[model samples]
Target chain A: PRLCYLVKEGGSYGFSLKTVQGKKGVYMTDITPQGVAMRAGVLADDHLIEVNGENVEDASHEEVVEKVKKSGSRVMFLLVDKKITKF
Target chain B: SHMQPRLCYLVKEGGSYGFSLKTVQGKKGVYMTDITPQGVAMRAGVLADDHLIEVNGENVEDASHEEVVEKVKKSGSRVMFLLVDKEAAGGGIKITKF
Candidate 1:
C-alpha cells in the first residue's frame, strides 16, 4: 500500500528543487528529522546550485530524487546564501 | 503578578489530546494551541474564552507562536494558570496542576 501511494503521488519517495536565475536550486521546505534528505544536508530555503556537478535548472521534484539516488552517498547541497544558519 | 499563561492540548472528538493546529479550522501557521485534556492549562481551569497573555514572564504578544510552545514544553512545573477575567473574558484567573 505504501509503495502504491509513492508511485501514485509522484513516482518517487522524495521532494523537488525549483531553479530561478540568480537563485539557488535545491530548496527544502518540510523535512523530517534525520530523514534521508535531512542527513543529505538538504535544509529549508537551501538553494542547490549543482547536483553531482550538473545544474538543477527546471529539475522536477522526482528528478532531484534520481540525482540523489545516483550519487549513492550523502548528497552535497550547494547553498546560495547562508540565511537561517541553524536548521 | 505570579499569574502565568497556561498551555493545553486541543481535545478531539474521541477525547484525545494533541490535535494538530492544521486540523483546526481557520488556524494558520504550524504548532497547535494548548487546549483541553492536555498539559497544565486543562488542570489550571483554562476555558475557551480566556486568551493567553504571557508565558514564563514573556509577553505572548511579542513571542512567536512557536516560541510559546517551546516554553510550555520546557517548563518543569506540573501546573500553570490562565489569567482570566482580566480582559473581561468569561473565565477566572487560577492555577491548575497536573
Candidate 2:
C-alpha cells in the first residue's frame, strides 16, 4: 500500500534515511529539529516505498539518497510506518 | 551568550541520526539520557550525561523534558544542542543561573 505525503524543503532537508550501518533496506534514520523533513511528518524508522512517484525499495542506499536529493526542493514520500508496525 | 560552547550537526539526506533523551529529577535541564546502540544520537558522540541547554537557539534551562521535546518536535529536523554542565567540571560547558 502507498500513501503520498508532501514536503517543501525551504532549505536543507535535515534528515538521514538509510538502513543500519550494515543492514538491509533504506529507512528514515533521523530527523533534525526545525529542518524540512521533520516538519513534513516523517519519522525515524519509516521504511521507504517511493519518492516523487519512483519506487525505491529496490534502489541502493546511495541511489535512494540521490533520488530524494534530486527531487528538487519539493518531494512526496510513500512509506510504511515500520516502527509502529514492529512495535 | 556567544561565549557558550556547543556542537552542530548537519543531518544529511540518508545519513546518521535519532535521539533518546530525558531530564533527571534534580537536574535543571534535559539530558541525552539514553541512546540506541546504533542510532544517530549514539554515533554523534552524544553521551547520557551530556546536558541539553538549547534547541534551535532556544534556551531550555527552564523548560521541562516534555516542553523541550515539544519544541524539538515542531522544530522540523534541523536542531542545535548546547550542552551546559557544572561550572566546576572545567572541560564541559558550565551554566550559572540566578
Candidate 3:
C-alpha cells in the first residue's frame, strides 16, 4: 500500500492514520526530513482535523488515503488548535 | 540541557540490524527498520549496516552505556562518535561528529 510505503520511506514523517469512532487523524510516531507534514509545520502532537476542505470527523482510513492520493497539488491539514485562524 | 535522547544503530546477523542509545540503558532504545531520511543520522553519515561501537572515545563494551549516552547528550550541537563498520569487508571508517 502507498500508505505503508510512505511511512516506510519517510514520506510523511512516520505518520500513521488513526481511526477513532470512524474519524481519522494522522498521528506521527517519528519525525522525518522534508516530509509534507514536516514542511507544512505540523507538530508532533497535532491532531489532523481535515484534509483540503473536507471534515474528517467521520472519514474512514481508506477514504482518507484516497483523499491524500487524489490531492495532487497541496493537502491542507486542519489541525486541532485552541485558537481559530482568521482566514 | 542540550543533551537529548536520540536513537543509535548497530549491525546484527543475517544483514539485519539493532539499535541502542548513546545515553540510556538496557533495551530502552527504540528499534526501527529505517531511519528518518536526511535527519541527524543521515547527516552524520550513519548507514543502515553500520554498527555503533563507541560515542566520543568510550567503548560501548567497557562502561555503562548510559554514560556514553550522557557524553553525547552533553556535547550539545556536535556529537562526535568513533564507529567501527562491522559490515565493511576491508574494515574501519571514522568521521568527525557535527
lDDT of each: 0.43, 0.64, 0.45
Clash list (residue pairs), candidate 3: B3-B73, B22-B69, B23-B69
DockQ of 1: 0.01
Query: Which residue segments of model 1 deviate by more than 4 Å?
Result: A1-26, A34-42, A81-87, B1-98
- Which candidate number has the best lDDT? 2
Model 3 spans > 4 angstroms off: A1-15, A20-29, A81-87, B1-98
lDDT by residue (B1-98, candidate 3, tens digit) is: 11222344322333322233443233322112254465556555554434445565555545554555566567655554555342331222221110
- Cα error, candidate 2, residue A86 (Å): 19
Model 1 chain A, poorest ten-residue lDDT window? Answer: A1-10
Q: Which one wins on TM-score?
A: 2
Candidate DockQ values, in order, are 0.01, 0.01, 0.01
Instruction: TM-score each candidate.
Output: 0.28, 0.40, 0.32
Scored on chain A only, each candidate's TM-score is 0.46, 0.74, 0.55
Model 2 C-alpha lDDT versus the unseen true structure: 0.64
lDDT of 3 at B26: 38
